[PDB]
Amino acid sequence: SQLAHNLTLSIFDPVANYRAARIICTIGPSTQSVEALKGLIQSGMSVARMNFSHGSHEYHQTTINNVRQAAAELGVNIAIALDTKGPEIRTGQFVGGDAVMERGATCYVTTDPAFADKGTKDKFYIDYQNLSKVVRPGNYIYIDDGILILQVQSHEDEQTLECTVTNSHTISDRRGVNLPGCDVDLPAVSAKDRVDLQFGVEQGVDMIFASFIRSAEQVGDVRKALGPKGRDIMIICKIENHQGVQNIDSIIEESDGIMVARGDLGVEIPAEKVVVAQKILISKCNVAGKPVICATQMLESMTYNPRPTRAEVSDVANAVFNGADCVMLSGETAKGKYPNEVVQYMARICLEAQSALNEYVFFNSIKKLQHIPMSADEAVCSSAVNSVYETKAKAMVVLSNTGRSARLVAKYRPNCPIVCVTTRLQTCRQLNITQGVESVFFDADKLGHDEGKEHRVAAGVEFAKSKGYVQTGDYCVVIHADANQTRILLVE
Amino acid sequence: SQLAHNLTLSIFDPVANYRAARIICTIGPSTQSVEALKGLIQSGMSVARMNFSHGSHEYHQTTINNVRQAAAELGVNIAIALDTKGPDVDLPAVSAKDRVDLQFGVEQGVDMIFASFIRSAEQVGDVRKALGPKGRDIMIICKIENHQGVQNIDSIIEESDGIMVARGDLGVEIPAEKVVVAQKILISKCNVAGKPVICATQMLESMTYNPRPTRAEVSDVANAVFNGADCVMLSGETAKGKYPNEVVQYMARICLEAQSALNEYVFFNSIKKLQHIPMSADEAVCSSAVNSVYETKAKAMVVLSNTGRSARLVAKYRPNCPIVCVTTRLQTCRQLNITQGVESVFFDADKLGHDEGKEHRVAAGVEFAKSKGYVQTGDYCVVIHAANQTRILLVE
Amino acid sequence: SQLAHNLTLSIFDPVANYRAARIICTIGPSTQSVEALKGLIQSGMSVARMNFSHGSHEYHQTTINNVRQAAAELGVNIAIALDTKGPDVDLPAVSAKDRVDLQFGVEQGVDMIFASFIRSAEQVGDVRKALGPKGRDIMIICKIENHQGVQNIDSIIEESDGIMVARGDLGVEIPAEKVVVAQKILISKCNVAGKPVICATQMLESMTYNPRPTRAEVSDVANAVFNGADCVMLSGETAKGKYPNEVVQYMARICLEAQSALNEYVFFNSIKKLQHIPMSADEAVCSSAVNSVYETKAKAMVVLSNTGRSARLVAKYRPNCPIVCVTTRLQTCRQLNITQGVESVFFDADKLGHDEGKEHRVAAGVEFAKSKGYVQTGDYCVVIHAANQTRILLVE
Amino acid sequence: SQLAHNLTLSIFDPVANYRAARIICTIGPSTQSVEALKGLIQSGMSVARMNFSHGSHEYHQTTINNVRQAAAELGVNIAIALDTKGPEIRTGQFVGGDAVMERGATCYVTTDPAFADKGTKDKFYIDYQNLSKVVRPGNYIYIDDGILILQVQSHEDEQTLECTVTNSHTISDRRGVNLPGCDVDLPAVSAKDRVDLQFGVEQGVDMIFASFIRSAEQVGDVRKALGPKGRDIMIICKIENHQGVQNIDSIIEESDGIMVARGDLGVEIPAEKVVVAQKILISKCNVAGKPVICATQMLESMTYNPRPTRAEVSDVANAVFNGADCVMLSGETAKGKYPNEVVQYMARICLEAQSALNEYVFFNSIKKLQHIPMSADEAVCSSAVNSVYETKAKAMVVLSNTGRSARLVAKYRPNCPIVCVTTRLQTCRQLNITQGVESVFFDADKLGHDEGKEHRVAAGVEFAKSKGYVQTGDYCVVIHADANQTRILLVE
Numbered sequence A, D: 001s002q003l004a005h006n007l008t009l010s011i012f013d014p015v016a017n018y019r020a021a022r023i024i025c026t027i028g029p030s031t032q033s034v035e036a037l038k039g040l041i042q043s044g045m046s047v048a049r050m051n052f053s054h055g056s057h058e059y060h061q062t063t064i065n066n067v068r069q070a071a072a073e074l075g076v077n078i079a080i081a082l083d084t085k086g087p088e089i090r091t092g093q094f095v096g097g098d099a100v101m102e103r104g105a106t107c108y109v110t111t112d113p114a115f116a117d118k119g120t121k122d123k124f125y126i127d128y129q130n131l132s133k134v135v136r137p138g139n140y141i142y143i144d145d146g147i148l149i150l151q152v153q154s155h156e157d158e159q160t161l162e163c164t165v166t167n168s169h170t171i172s173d174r175r176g177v178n179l180p181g182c183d184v185d186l187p188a189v190s191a192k193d194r195v196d197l198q199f200g201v202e203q204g205v206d207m208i209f210a211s212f213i214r215s216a217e218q219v220g221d222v223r224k225a226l227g228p229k230g231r232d233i234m235i236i237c238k239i240e241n242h243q244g245v246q247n248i249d250s251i252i253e254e255s256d257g258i259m260v261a262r263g264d265l266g267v268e269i270p271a272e273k274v275v276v277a278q279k280i281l282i283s284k285c286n287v288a289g290k291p292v293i294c295a296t297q298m299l300e301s302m303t304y305n306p307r308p309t310r311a312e313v314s315d316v317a318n319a320v321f322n323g324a325d326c327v328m329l330s331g332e333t334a335k336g337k338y339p340n341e342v343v344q345y346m347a348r349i350c351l352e353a354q355s356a357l358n359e360y361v362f363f364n365s366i367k368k369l370q371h372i373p374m375s376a377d378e379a380v381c382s383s384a385v386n387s388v389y390e391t392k393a394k395a396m397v398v399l400s401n402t403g404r405s406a407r408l409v410a411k412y413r414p415n416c417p418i419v420c421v422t423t424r425l426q427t428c429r430q431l432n433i434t435q436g437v438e439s440v441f442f443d444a445d446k447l448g449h450d451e452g453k454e455h456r457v458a459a460g461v462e463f464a465k466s467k468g469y470v471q472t473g474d475y476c477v478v479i480h481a482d483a484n485q486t487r488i489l490l491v492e
Numbered sequence B, C: 001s002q003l004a005h006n007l008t009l010s011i012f013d014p015v016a017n018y019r020a021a022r023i024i025c026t027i028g029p030s031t032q033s034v035e036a037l038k039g040l041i042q043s044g045m046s047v048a049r050m051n052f053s054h055g056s057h058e059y060h061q062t063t064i065n066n067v068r069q070a071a072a073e074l075g076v077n078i079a080i081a082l083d084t085k086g087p088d089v090d091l092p093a094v095s096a097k098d099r100v101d102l103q104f105g106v107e108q109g110v111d112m113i114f115a116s117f118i119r120s121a122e123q124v125g126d127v128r129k130a131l132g133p134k135g136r137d138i139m140i141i142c143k144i145e146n147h148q149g150v151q152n153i154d155s156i157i158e159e160s161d162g163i164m165v166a167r168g169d170l171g172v173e174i175p176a177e178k179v180v181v182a183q184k185i186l187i188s189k190c191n192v193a194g195k196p197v198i199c200a201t202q203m204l205e206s207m208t209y210n211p212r213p214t215r216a217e218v219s220d221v222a223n224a225v226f227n228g229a230d231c232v233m234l235s236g237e238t239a240k241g242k243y244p245n246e247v248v249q250y251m252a253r254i255c256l257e258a259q260s261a262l263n264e265y266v267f268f269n270s271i272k273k274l275q276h277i278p279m280s281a282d283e284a285v286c287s288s289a290v291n292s293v294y295e296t297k298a299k300a301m302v303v304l305s306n307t308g309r310s311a312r313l314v315a316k317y318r319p320n321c322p323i324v325c326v327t328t329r330l331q332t333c334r335q336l337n338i339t340q341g342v343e344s345v346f347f348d349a350d351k352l353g354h355d356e357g358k359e360h361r362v363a364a365g366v367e368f369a370k371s372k373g374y375v376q377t378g379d380y381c382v383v384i385h386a387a388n389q390t391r392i393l394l395v396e
């Protein structure tokens, strides 16, 4: 029945008047100014990502301020995301900053700290103390973004591995390393992260994009690192290796969402398996009711070219068809030449794919997996979305203080916009990673506690009127969950 | 339910024992020799494509002869296809050259035509006319290259034997994001019609001069398989490329991986829900034959087909096991190379009798499945001769 | 799936905590006194029927007064119904006597009419005319007694407030086996329309003079409930019978037993599959409210209804729990007595305020369900005011 | 969707050209002559039941001969059923053949054999040795078809029960007794049965209607009593009490079919519960794929009246709607006044109900309960019937030597006739209790072993042509199961 829906499509018919997918932009040189962040919002940015791989706290403080000021000038709410550096496995130094590794040659990798600066083509340092304890003969070591492949022959001692060089490649100082068939037990957060996170709390960030997540226990470590004052910040887990993939179920349970880092996974896993891994992860998140980001290598060529390749375009479309809440831009907005154009084009592709997407298959698929008896909240939200399909309603209004019920509704995928009416600002921002949802702040301090709920509902319906989703005569499905309620409202 | 099926998947499991999707390679400078063609076959080529936009009849004649030699030396059957040069505007359907070329194809005994620039339904009748009565058995696959082909897709499919989505050609007028969507449309319309569809141009292009393709190119091929394409096509990658064998082998690997992830039952069920009641007998037999694969968890189907018709009918319903087609016409073997999920076995009547009680043909099919590791003793296997007959056989 | 539900049944299990089907008793010589009527109520009577084929307006006036006294003394609400004497032929719809009688019914404030011998749709408008503007709120239940009523059933249902299958009358022209089948038809058409239907005549007749009925009579009543009848009717058994209380009590026992065997979900689902998309809001709210009973296994519904309309709308979808209707009009309580699966609670506005925030009404409904043992702490309960609203309430 | 099907019905439209339900007639005084058995066949008798409660072997030998000669004269095949007497609990004798039991009075029932002839209102004999060991205080004893109810107060000794008489009723010599809340452990077959069965084998009867079945173990006892030469005779279990009902699952597994004896069950169980018990038993049999007979009190009033009551008519119709393969006539044909008329009317009622019956609900319901993976045979038969619905075929041809695959097909309930083509005569008779199936004998001895199957198929299709179910152009679904096969045949 996606198939059936395909039969009735016409590419000349008008696209939807709404875009369900959300866009995350990485901020850097090309876009850190208030006037550029402004052009980014208008192009369709909902989330601003700061990459703490680079920059000092000083640089990001500017991004924060520039974001908060861009948003407030445009009257909108924009999420601020902190993407951590995370633990790294790297080489040490080489004599003459360099070491020409030739295919067939033998070399020795050592965890012996003495060799940190005096590396040679023959014996050099890798900074991960457990290397020997975790690698075994036959396994591979990737150095320099997977380019250099060394095969492990044996242990020279308990600190040194004898390796065959399997392919020629020159490598220089401090290259990154990957262990494709190895369970890496680095801690969850690096000493730096712990400081960067602490900073994030202090500065009131919305979500952590947590690097190199490999197990559920590690999500706890990240949480415990955000400490007692960080309990409302969302942890979005970056899945970057086989471990993340193997442990996905338990990781999804503990976390608040998922980022599929295709490029990182790609270093260690064949591209065609990463495609499939994207499918699995997006679908698990859809079923769990948690946002999922499709990240890296999205419209990469458009970092320096005016238009992207055909294949990059289908890549973006097919992330939407897979079920991504979000698509992310990295270099294309951090240091690209067409930062507005890329966001605009991404929005257009998403919008096109959404018009081809049969949402009803999602609703069905997710509803079919519910255990009977359902809990009240699951029942109210799914029947609310069912009511949309059955009455052809044209908007939904969701009253939610923490975003929870808005995410519960969005999970069921109605074929019309969801308007969340909330009394928390951080909620309006945090929902920026949830597909199909738009927020409205309701100031309970100034406008009253609305214990009746009539004002928030009215605020909801008016919001949907200005945007032109509903007009007089259309239907609109209202929901307050947690005590609960549902109404099918005729619009006046 | 593709969604539910995704939930159960592991990328660390072993891949399926067979690849369903089919690879078409354009022949050229890199690949015209008997040996290079042998490499192509072993790498995963099912169909040799001659681009008649280049080279003389002598060049192409050489392609045909070498393909035949390479295949016969390897003991397989390879399809040969003629891709015509061709002409909101309307020029004639076939050009004068096209008409000359098509006649040549018939004399040489090509298996199918890739008709360029098809824009409407009578244009197919023209290609059919130009092939004359001696080319009546030759498949016509229509290349959809502009908005008119898209607009008139329904009637074009009705008349043709299949479709090719030419993404690159379509992309000149139509924005890229819309080609993606048109790809979905055309593939699904063809799946429903039960006719082969080829996803073509811009497949793994960077691999024409690079040893490995881009990640985006990889998902393109996989998503073509997920869309429902029977076939994926290589152009420059094999004709003038530097890595012809590597590109084919990779395309095969991508397809096998995608297929492990693909839920065939979603296809079966979606296509079944569309059948009008009452069904005709051929339709009912084939759908319910595939239905029986699912209900009994049969590990292979065996289809007796002379013209390949009932083979394509079974394949349309997308069983989750290999389909072995047993046939008396070597042309059917070649032609079934554009139909996903099917492998052919030639039964030589002139050398083994007419077998009008079907026992021997059936036995050759089951033996083939046994030899390919699809079924062993105690597995079920669904046999269909469509006059028609289903049989659920316990394999001994 | 009634089939699958049958598989899981045990006749040795305890019966359901409530009876859904409703019992109508004809009043007469055996049962006209205040005490006898009290016996009838306690035995299971929901609706007193006056046969206006017999007795004067004085006789019937006595029925009305005694019924009112008996009910008020017991603290329940009993519906009063006027069954008119009435006229391939066509006489007029109402006779002169009928017209006089109907006017009398309005003055007295009867709850519903049982219109004899209805043969077509305008004939209903006539009954409606004869009731005048002061009887606009009175339900008209059409008695289908011959082939014309059967033939014109669709349009008759459209205009009426409900139907009565008069098996005995129908049986004079139509062979018995066909009446059985016509019973199925009429009941199902009414279930779909969402209007009450009464199965009447020849119910437990041998029990007019025998202390127990025949086994066949017993399955007749049970199969009426299985067909989907809202109501079952006693005629001579209670009017002139020897065992009026025993017959009612037995009818109740048969109904309770049948209902334990009945799968309500088959009804819900069958009726749902028939709704045209898009549904209007009232329809969608009620179907999905019942849907929520099933999905959450709620143990009771609470419906706020002033005219009983949304109560009959919910009841149409056949939840598998009791429906408690809270209402400001005592007439609604009486009228809902011909609707299966519903029990009413009177909310007196003049004594408790308009409760336009609905809290107090809802609370009286839940308290009623608590008191009847339907829900306890931790059970779910589905509340609906249809402007409209569903709520899934956790009972404290 | 029976509901939906009801919406489209018109009682004036023509009834089906075929009757799926089968009719069992008890033979006695009114119908034992060859010319009466002939009028019974023409009225619609498929099965002739002999009630070994009455008559000597001599009387039944006549019924047998008269049946076999009636059938052979009409060219048809008719089943011969032996209904056993079974174990009985009875009283002994009373002084003056009588004892006036008055309500409130006390009495003593004893298993003491000495009291066999000298029973009084005060103390009398009941012939079931285990009575005391199985009854306990509070339980009831029914004497004389449930009319007299005695309540058990206590044990006078280990052989004698003290009883309150709960209602007045005079009782005479040798009245039957029932123990409504007691697990009666009488053996499966009485000494007489053992002789009657032995006779049945010898005389080649088709099916045993086995009385008072209470457990699966007892079906084994009946089987073992039919001995080695009786292995192809069908055992149809009569369910007559709470035990039969409680043990139904295991009883159905061991037996070849079920008779719902409503009157017998009625002695001990309230009528409204018997209605429901009928529902359960018919449905279990439908799912098991085994014939079920609806028996007793069917058209009883028509034993002496020309026409039956309305309620008896709906009783018969609703047995068809419940899913009965068969409806049975007892006294109405054994000793009634209108033996032809009753059979004719029964046939008419069945035919009417069948036209109202949506068979597709049955097919669906039964198919939905199949375990996946199915076994080949289950798959072939269900898909064959599915093919009927999908192609609107108008007959089925089933090649079956033992009837097994014909019963497997019939279980799935196609909406068209099933023609079984068989090489066994006992098979043609034994299928007389299976709804929707007609048989044809194929003489493999004389016409050849047809290992191709083309002749039997041809015999099938021609049989369906003469009956007018199929004409040139219609579809017909053919099946050989056990190796197997299915064909959708276009009729020439």
Ligand SMILES: O=S(=O)(O)c1ccc2sc(S(=O)(=O)O)nc2c1
Binding pocket: A026, A027, A028, A029, A051, A054, A055, A330, A331, A332, A334, A335
């Ligand atoms: O100034 S730099 O060019 O060093 C620079 C600074 C910040 C970022 S963030 C990213 S990302 O796209 O990889 O996330 N790239 C860069 C590059």
Ligand SMILES: O=S(=O)(O)c1ccc2sc(S(=O)(=O)O)nc2c1
Binding pocket: B026, B027, B028, B029, B051, B054, B055, B234, B235, B236, B237, B239, B240
């Ligand atoms: O001899 S050439 O190198 O000119 C040559 C010959 C044949 C073909 S076919 C294709 S295509 O499939 O990529 O369009 N390109 C070429 C190039």
Ligand SMILES: O=S(=O)(O)c1ccc2sc(S(=O)(=O)O)nc2c1
Binding pocket: C026, C027, C028, C029, C051, C054, C055, C234, C235, C236, C237, C239, C240
């Ligand atoms: O006083 S009488 O005994 O004549 C008498 C009075 C009223 C009624 S109502 C019915 S009926 O419901 O059975 O048709 N029978 C009678 C009989």
Ligand SMILES: O=S(=O)(O)c1ccc2sc(S(=O)(=O)O)nc2c1
Binding pocket: D026, D027, D028, D029, D051, D054, D055, D330, D331, D332, D334, D335
């Ligand atoms: O000659 S008798 O009237 O004694 C007589 C003989 C045989 C049978 S068989 C039945 S049955 O209908 O109960 O099965 N009743 C009778 C009655």
